Design a protein around this ligand. Structure first.
Ligand SMILES: [Mg+2]
Ligand SMILES: [Mg+2]
Ligand SMILES: [Mg+2]
Ligand SMILES: [Mg+2]
Ligand SMILES: [Mg+2]
Ligand SMILES: [Mg+2]
Ligand SMILES: [Mg+2]
Ligand SMILES: [Mg+2]
Ligand SMILES: [Mg+2]
Ligand SMILES: [Zn+2]
Lengths: 86, 135, 99, 220, 97
RNA sequence: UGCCAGCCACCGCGGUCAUACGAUUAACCCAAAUUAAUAGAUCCACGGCGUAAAGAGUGUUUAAGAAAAAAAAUCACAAU
């Protein structure tokens, strides 16, 4: 979201975010299902599926998004461009 | 609220999953109707890539032996005297007559093209159709 | 019951073959001043100009005789991915339904 | 309240419940020219599994599949009308504009045949009003707009979680359409046939609703 | 077991291919008439394809022939030989309007 | 104090309303240690080469490799 004022942009981005929602399947409601590797544009995300006791070892942004999804155990390395949106 | 991503999956996928997560607390009508009688294909998004290299399509061209005859008929006599009615479902043209005559003289065992052709022309002249031909 | 193949094989459009220079019967379903919009029954209507000889004999519902050139007027042009449909057919208006 | 759940649950247990099977046939369709597509140069890539073949440059739509699809499409459309929900007829074609507006008026259904305003489905509350209901099904008699691009309302009904029935010609894109029926949208008998078909499915649905309602009121 | 299904034959209706006026003729440097048909009367220039309307093969052939006949002393370069002025005009150009 | 005096690992700070200099108040964080300087440990490419560093002006053979399943050498036009 984008505005002249910071507050406004915050609001816009919240309310707009509700509209685009994904369902993310969770194996046993903590990890993901299987190992993922993806190259999106110039970014490389590589995510490995952990056992129960191993909490969220990840780029901080990914840890955030994960706490919001409900994924409690993961490992993810990002390489190439770390640009946030991408 | 909803899921405005068109590209993610089918409307059914997104809706069902959104309900499943407890986000959408009211089930729409068209959901149950869909559940009862699903479409043939999942209406998922797909991108129309252009085709490259050697790859072509699988579409078959439509041809029958009757055509192989109609070609000769049109080469000699052109389009028939009766014009065409594409409104009439059961309409048979001059060429179609010629086709059936040729098919019937083929069942008599004549393997020569000239015999079959000229004698189907005579078998048509017998019924009273005029073939003016072309130069 | 009739298989779709069976119907297609014997239909009047299948019998015609190539649509070039074909004598066809068609009907006028619409009119603008000099323009006669003519459904000859294939897919698209064609559009012919009202001749000078017996001009008023051509009305909505009238039947006429055509020489079919093209079923659908279409061509591909420089730098395009697909062809360009004019959404018409190409014909010559000869005379009207001598009967 | 339990018997209202009965009146909603009952029709889903029969395949033919409004008996629409008898409204058309392969021959019926064939005589409406429905099997006829555009030139092969204009073919859309996703349309090939729906093609019986190409006869001398013209694309012939397989009417077996057309019937198989149209069955399900009409089935859905009637079930929607039965459950009391909004049906919108969308086409941007100026020949059949009047015909379609007429058709929808006569089914007691709504029609947008005009220029589609940009935020219409996406931003409803501003364009239409303070709070609104949106069509529970949208029917496309023409999936294209007069510049030959896909009608926006396809992408935006997808976006909105609305199911979509449409007649997808040889050059149209079926992908984002929920119940596509492959067939001819250009020639008048085809458009008229489909207009009529959907009209009848709607009318039958609404009637059966009325009658099963009367039966429900006499039950107690 | 359906006999109404289409047959994978090549196109029977397919027309013959159109032909250069000279398709299977022989262009000879020795005959100045046929050559000077393709020359501009006033200039002596050689007309291109868009004018003469030939297969590439025959446009080439006519050209090479013309050049050869010109240097061997059979045909004049700077004008069409007056004698051949009233021969059939096969070219698509219109000077006088 | 006023682009002075000074500060900084990198961005940078100081021109009269300096949370960046100097001192005071408060706080933070390590702790018998705390900072600075210097060496290490770690760290480059199983990535790339149209526009960013990068396909070497051209062809042939040697060395050295690959052969991993199916075939081929060859005809209008301005090579030398
Ligand atoms: Mg169309
Ligand atoms: Mg200091
Ligand atoms: Mg101060
Ligand atoms: Mg500092
Ligand atoms: Mg200080
Ligand atoms: Mg690097
Ligand atoms: Mg470079
Ligand atoms: Mg080079
Ligand atoms: Mg150099
Ligand atoms: Zn030639």
């Amino acid at each position: 979201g984008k505005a002249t004022e910071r507050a406004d942009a915050f609001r816009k981005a919240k309310n707009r975010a509700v509209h685009y929602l994904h369902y993310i399947e969770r194996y046993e409601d903590h990890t993901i299902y299987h190992d993922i590797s993806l190259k999106f544009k110039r970014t490389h995300i590589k995510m490995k599926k952990q056992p129960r006791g191993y909490g969220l070892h990840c780029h901080r942004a990914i840890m955030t998004i994960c706490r919001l999804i409900g994924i409690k155990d993961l490992y993810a390395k990002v390489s190439g461009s770390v640009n946030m949106l991408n | 609220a909803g899921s405005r991503l068109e590209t993610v999956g089918s409307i059914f996928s997104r809706t069902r999953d959104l309900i499943r997560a407890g986000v959408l607390k009211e089930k729409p009508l068209w959901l149950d109707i869909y559940n009862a009688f699903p479409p043939l294909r999942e209406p998922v998004f797909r991108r129309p890539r252009l085709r490259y290299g050697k790859a072509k399509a699988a579409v078959q061209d439509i041809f029958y032996h009757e055509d192989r005859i109609r070609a000769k008929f049109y080469s000699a006599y052109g389009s028939g005297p009766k014009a065409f009615d594409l409104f009439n479902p059961n309409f048979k043209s001059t060429c179609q007559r010629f086709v059936e005559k040729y098919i019937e003289l083929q069942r008599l065992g004549e393997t020569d093209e000239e015999k079959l052709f000229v004698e189907a022309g005579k078998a048509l002249l017998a019924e009273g159709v005029t073939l003016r031909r072309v130069g | 019951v009739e298989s779709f193949a069976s119907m297609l094989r014997h239909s009047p459009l299948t019998q015609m073959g190539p649509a070039k220079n074909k004598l066809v019967i068609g009907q006028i379903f619409h009119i603008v001043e000099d323009d006669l919009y003519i459904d000859f029954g294939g897919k698209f209507h064609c559009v012919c100009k009202r001749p000078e000889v017996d001009g008023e004999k051509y009305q909505k519902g009238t039947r006429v005789r055509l020489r079919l050139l093209d079923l659908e007027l279409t061509s591909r042009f420089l730098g395009a991915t697909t062809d360009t449909t004019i959404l018409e057919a190409d014909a010559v208006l000869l005379g009207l339904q001598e009967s | 309240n339990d018997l209202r759940d009965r009146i909603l649950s009952e029709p889903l247990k029969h395949a033919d419940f409004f008996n629409l099977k008898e409204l058309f046939s392969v021959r019926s369709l064939f005589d409406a020219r429905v099997h006829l597509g555009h030139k092969a140069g204009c073919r859309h890539r996703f349309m090939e599994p729906y093609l019986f073949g190409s006869r001398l440059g013209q694309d012939i739509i397989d009417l077996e599949q057309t019937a198989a699809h149209l069955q399900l499409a009409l089935n859905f459309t009637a079930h929607v009308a039965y459950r009391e929900g909004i049906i919108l007829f969308v086409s941007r074609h100026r020949q059949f504009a009047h015909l379609i507006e007429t058709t929808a008026r006569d089914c007691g259904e709504y029609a947008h045949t005009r220029y589609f305003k940009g935020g219409l489905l996406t931003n409803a509350p501003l364009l239409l009003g303070p709070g609104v209901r949106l069509p529970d099904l949208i029917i496309f008699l023409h999936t294209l707009n007069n510049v030959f691009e896909p009608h926006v309302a396809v992408r935006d009904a997808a976006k909105m979680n609305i199911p979509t029935v449409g007649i997808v010609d040889t050059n149209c894109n079926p992908a984002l359409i929920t119940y596509p029926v492959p067939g001819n949208d250009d020639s008048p008998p085809a458009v008229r046939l489909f207009c009529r078909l959907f009209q009848v499915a709607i009318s039958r649905a609404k009637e059966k609703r009325r009658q099963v309602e009367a039966l429900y009121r006499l039950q107690g | 077991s359906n006999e109404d299904l289409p047959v994978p034959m090549e196109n029977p209706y397919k027309e013959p291919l159109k032909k250069c006026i000279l398709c299977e003729k022989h262009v000879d440097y020795k005959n100045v008439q046929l050559l000077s048909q393709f020359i501009s009367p006033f200039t002596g220039c050689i007309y291109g394809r868009h004018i003469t309307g030939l297969c590439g093969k025959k446009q080439k052939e006519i050209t090479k022939a013309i050049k050869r006949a010109q240097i061997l002393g059979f045909m004049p370069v700077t004008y069409k030989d007056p004698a051949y002025l009233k021969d059939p005009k096969v070219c698509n150009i219109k000077y006088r309007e």
